[PDB]
Design a protein around this ligand. Structure first.
Ligand SMILES: [Mn+2]
Ligand SMILES: [Mn+2]
Lengths: 433, 433
């Protein structure tokens, strides 16, 4: 598993329970040095959160290689190491723990390097990070998941599958959503080694697969001298291939993204006979087909009414709706540096769907992608009004998943902290209701 | 293997030879989208290097999943994909290839997304990167290696062992140097699975292990009420444990870093009987012990003369010297933001050893760590005068390794491009001589 560049890691910042009592909190620290060293060279860590915690360097306890020690036990110990590949787990005693939210955590880590003269010793590392506590809030009635699209540029550059899965299980989320054409290696035929390893990681971290994203590329052969349009048989075979891979990996929903033929995102005309050809296969494998309702398409739209008309005409239980919460955005996404207003499309200011419009279509919504762009250190969302949205979902009777979809700036490791802030914000709102 | 955040990757930017003729150059591109797609959705890549290359979007060739195609073959193809985990290899036809150095490479990649309206299509990605060509210069008589210390904060956060080894083999380097207490997992007892995997990767990328860095922490039990000093038997067992692990992994040199007892970096007094106790084990395993000569210690020093006196007294062939080229630094390392002059030590301005002082000790130098901090796009080093240094090494008869040690700013992925610039600079100087 990979770590972050910040010494204080976001994953693992939790409260610690011993016998039903919260006895303190913990967090994980990356080794700042270029090597891992023996644990007796540790000279302590001082932990400070302003207003809540201020402990000295000898107060916290160290979990190194699966065993917890005090600092005096580390000084007399032998054989215990802080490896470079491992993050040290620092337990700070605080009866009752920390409250939910983002905390300004400041550490003062001391290490003894023997090759440095004694006057410049110990080596001191002072970092400050705004870290989000793993949510103590039990956000019933919703279930909580994370889409791997939230780590868009992070996956494959700073993150692999196990590091992403470890971060999802640390939030307390139980679902994981992938894009199948991005996160399944050797698509569409993963090896039997990978599929058995994929099922091992789901039982390790306690995650269940929920949604697999799919595409039906209608402009697959549009370019060239022999440029043509995708037919129904080539289009139905694309969706049927994705339903079999989602059944093979344990997923429950498939979201097909059909190509468009106009500026209003009107779907390609083959979609209604591609989907109806694959509804026999979906009912056999028990996977629900759910196309996405995302901005600039509001709920009161002709495209959305075509999805509801397809369910009543066919009478199927394996077609549903996926709701993207970017349609509820009321404040504009900020301007990228280098552009003036006018050349970006006008739906990036938010289309402002009133959240009471979910009452019309909630009996066909099977899955919700919690789309967001920016949450600051006060747990204030900058684009989505989460409190009237979650109030309308709760009163309409939604009890399914809310998968995080981070859409913000793809700064490296920024998406890890942002998804933590969203689960902390949503679970705190759902307890306030 | 992991990739970099930049679309243009530094690793793989080479010249391409077909039948002994350089027919063009290649480079690798990360997929900018959030998914991998079928290769017929590619609408071309336009490649421009100012003054040398300017080709259209349909001119380069694409190597996807182990097979090379033209753009017209991609448009009619079926089943070929650009996976998200793979970087596409772009062959640009240019008879004769590019010269050595850093090139301002500008691409204009076009991809067709079917879910986007036709007026905003194709999706265009324009990035510019200063990338270093893999060196065409054959820098004889030296051999070339990379130390994994060059990727100090990158290893474990953005990089693993195979990604680091793939980048070393792309330079044309043949040696790899590790720090054993940092890069061997479960130190000092790696699993038999890891050791067999470590030997598989060395034969895959054609690397031989050269140097393993070691520490003898004399302040291991200095803190606490029972604080004591490290004895000879505890110190000799530390060095003997590291010689056995370096013999197990195939390394030829061990560099022990002993702790100091004064401001002049005078070594701990146990060092001369720790080393002489381990010289029987070194001659049996055929590993050379080589302590490091690094700044602020010059070559004309009392510490260095003690190493030469130990070789003549014992008469051993398994003790040698390691030369760190930070002692030849003549221009100052720039000030970190936030400090004024005076609180940093005065050897960070460079101690300015004249490079003709290697003629005194070259018969005991077995290994050289090519230390550097900054090389810009004109292949100009900012701290080390590489041309008189390499001229003195060549005339003294050195024919061993020059392992890269990057010491600069630990910006993420910065160390990959910096080590490429150093091998390009050194091999070009060694051909100018
Ligand atoms: Mn979405
Ligand atoms: Mn060095």
């Amino acid at each position: 598993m990979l770590l972050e560049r910040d010494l204080i890691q976001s994953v693992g910042f939790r409260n610690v329970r011993e016998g039903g009592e919260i006895t303190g909190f913990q967090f994980r620290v990356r080794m700042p040095s270029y090597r891992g060293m023996a644990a007796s060279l540790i000279d302590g860590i001082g932990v400070r959160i302003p207003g809540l915690v201020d402990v000295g360097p000898d107060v916290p306890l160290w979990t190194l290689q699966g065993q917890q020690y005090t600092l005096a036990e580390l000084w007399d110990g032998d054989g215990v190491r802080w490896p470079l590949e491992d993050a040290a787990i620092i337990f700070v005693p605080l009866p009752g723990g920390l409250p939910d939210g983002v905390h300004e955590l400041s550490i003062e880590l001391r290490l003894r390097m023997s090759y440095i003269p004694q006057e410049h010793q110990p080596s001191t590392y002072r970092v400050t990070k705004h870290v989000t506590l793993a949510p103590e809030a039990s956000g019933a009635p919703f279930r909580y998941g994370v889409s791997l699209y939230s780590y868009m540029s992070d996956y494959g550059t700073v993150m692999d599958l196990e590091t992403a899965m470890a971060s999802i299980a640390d939030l307390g989320a139980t679902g994981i959503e992938i894009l199948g054409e991005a996160h399944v290696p050797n698509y569409p035929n993963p090896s039997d080694e990978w599929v058995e390893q994929w099922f091992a990681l789901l039982s390790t971290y306690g995650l269940e697969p929920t949604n697999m994203g799919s595409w039906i590329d209608t402009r697959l052969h549009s370019s060239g001298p022999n440029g043509r349009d995708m037919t129904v048989e080539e289009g139905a075979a694309a969706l049927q291939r994705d339903l079999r891979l989602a059944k093979r990996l344990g997923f429950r929903f498939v979201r097909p993204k059909i190509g468009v033929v106009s500026s209003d995102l009107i779907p390609h005309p083959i979609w209604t006979e591609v989907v109806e050809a694959s509804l026999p296969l979906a009912e056999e494998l028990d996977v629900i087909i759910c196309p996405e309702i995302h901005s600039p398409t509001p709920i009161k739209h002709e495209v959305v009414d075509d999805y509801i008309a397809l369910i009543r005409r066919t009478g199927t239980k394996h077609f549903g709706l996926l709701l993207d919460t970017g349609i509820f955005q009321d404040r504009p996404i900020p301007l990228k540096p280098g552009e003036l207003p006018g050349q970006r499309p006008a739906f990036l200011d938010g289309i402002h769907v009133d959240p009471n419009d979910v009452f019309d279509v909630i009996e066909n919504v099977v899955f919700i992608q919690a789309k967001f762009h920016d949450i600051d250190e006060e747990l204030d969302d900058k684009q989505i009004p989460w409190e009237p949205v979650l109030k309308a979902l709760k009163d309409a009777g939604y009890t399914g998943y809310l998968s995080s979809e981070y859409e913000g700036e793809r700064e490296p490791w920024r998406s890890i902290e942002q998804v933590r802030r969203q689960h902390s914000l949503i679970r705190q709102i759902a307890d306030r209701l």
